[PDB]
Symmetry: C3
Amino acid sequence: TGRPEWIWLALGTALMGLGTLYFLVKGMGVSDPDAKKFYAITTLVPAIAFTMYLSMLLGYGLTMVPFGGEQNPIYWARYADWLFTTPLLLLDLALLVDADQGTILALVGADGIMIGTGLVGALTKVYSYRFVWWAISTAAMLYILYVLFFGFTSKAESMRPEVASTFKVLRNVTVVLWSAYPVVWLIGSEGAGIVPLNIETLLFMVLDVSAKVGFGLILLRSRAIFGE
Amino acid sequence: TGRPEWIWLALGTALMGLGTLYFLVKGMGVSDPDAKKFYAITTLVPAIAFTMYLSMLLGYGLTMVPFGGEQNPIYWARYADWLFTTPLLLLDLALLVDADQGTILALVGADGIMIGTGLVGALTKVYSYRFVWWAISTAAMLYILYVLFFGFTSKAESMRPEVASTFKVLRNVTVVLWSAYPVVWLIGSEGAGIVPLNIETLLFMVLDVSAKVGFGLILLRSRAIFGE
Amino acid sequence: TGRPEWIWLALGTALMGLGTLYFLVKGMGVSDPDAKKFYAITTLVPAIAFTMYLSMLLGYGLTMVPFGGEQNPIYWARYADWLFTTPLLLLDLALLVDADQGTILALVGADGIMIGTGLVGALTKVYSYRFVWWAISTAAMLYILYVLFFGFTSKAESMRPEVASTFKVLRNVTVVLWSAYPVVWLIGSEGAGIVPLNIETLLFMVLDVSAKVGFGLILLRSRAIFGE
Ligand SMILES: *C/C=C(C)/C=C/C=C(C)/C=C/C1=C(C)CCCC1(C)C
Ligand SMILES: *C/C=C(C)/C=C/C=C(C)/C=C/C1=C(C)CCCC1(C)C
Ligand SMILES: *C/C=C(C)/C=C/C=C(C)/C=C/C1=C(C)CCCC1(C)C
């Protein structure tokens, strides 16, 4: 519970905060309208995560959930974070390939379902039911990955070269990191409990920083964000 | 409470899920940009309701509220559903007639107030106060219906013929079904308690499926969704 | 707690309700597309506050939070209000100067952090931690004010004259009123408790009505809202 994993929470807080400041300073030197959208979106991601990681570190974003026959510590603050940061990350990818509003809404909607059902599962009191919510959230995740490959990948190409390769790299990064979350949830304290909360927190911290700060570094350092 | 009405909840879950899959498959054959927006919006509606109906069926979206001198079972998951699905349904209607952003914001805002105040009323502990919230939510609903008739109906016409007639039918469907919700709430467990929760659940299930799946069928089967 | 301050809550409810109705009637005489956006945004602000002030008056939006060694009455309904009304007010300012989407997202995001962290601080059980959240929220507020002066003020000018002067006055009004909120929070029941809840409620009521109704009056009475 709220002790062993404090170091990963403090490290996560520090890393999200440092990334936010870096992106903020880096973006000061920005005039291009479109480059500005990418900077605004990308800087807000770590900023939000920073606040939620801090809430977990201080103990606010933690709650106890009874199930399986025990009082299980559940960090609900993660979902509040993801509810806002995941769609923003998807927005960066969509803006990059200039997706139509229809596909953007589909991605944002699918993302809301993924995080929402993930939260319902995290707080469910009936053990077996938790995995039903996990499956539904996982289906929503696969839909998103499908759109990113069969509804996006085919358009980045019909666009500028630099946009295509940058999108391809960010797309690959997203697919790899995002797919790891359901696995961590399944084996950790929220699911089967095969991995202790301490290790679970460490895993999510590494994934989060990479999916947010790592992702932002790649994106904000490319020329694909400027109007040619 | 959480037993007799299980069948309507299970039927609702199954019907929302089947509708979502149908719209998903049907939309695979879709290239037109605008047709895509209508499919994305319309498919997300049943998808969300599906998750909330399931949460109620499993018991997660149910809570007890003390008032009138009793512990009353209240399915709060309904509001979480409506908070997202009603504005999306309004968006389908607005896109159909190509409404201006000003009117869209007014409808979305009025809708948020309607659902939000409806939720406050559902959880209020002072019996008489529950109806004050019901009245305010009902006023917000009338505003929406007013805009749909005196701010929308007059524009669908100044547009394409097929757009006008389809909008007219969906407009009529909406007015009829939506107006029934406040009545059901008033006579059911949330309000006067003249109708038992069992029958109340049945009523909302029929209304929901019709307002979502029924509505989607009419819309997604018309040529009004394509750019001529 | 829920008694002495009832008059300020009732006065606030009445004033927000009267403002909403006034803006609603005033806006009936509106055809211009852009003028419509300003009316829709501006009327929704008092409408939302009206509902939240009423929830506080009736006792629904009030909760007890343990900290410092006492059971402290906290009106959480304020944050639900601000979560929606502050970004809408920022939207009025942004539309006025025709800001780019990038800056709009930055303002909305910064605003969400400001209100969200303010709420976390309001509900935090560890006294000293409450001020950590206050500081973070205050930093987010300063960012918003910075953008309004160094990212907005310089564009209203490169626009129409009437737009510039109206924006300047609304900008000034916002800076003055918004800066007062963190001060009131710090000295009131949410923070140091130097000022009693009764006086705290009075202060927020005066600020809210001015920042919403006062603000709306200035904006909706100017010609800057019309397309020349
Ligand atoms: C900054 C945070 C990021 C990029 C988070 C991504 C999170 C996910 C892809 C989470 C997915 C989940 C499932 C697919 C099912 C089980 C529950 C979740 C929410 C952990
Ligand atoms: C998919 C769901 C739909 C179309 C739901 C519509 C719901 C309403 C129009 C609800 C209205 C209510 C009132 C007018 C006042 C009493 C409380 C509500 C929320 C039941
Ligand atoms: C209609 C309401 C308005 C314009 C509200 C404005 C509120 C603020 C600028 C609140 C700011 C706060 C901080 C800067 C830190 C402490 C907590 C808050 C939320 C009171």
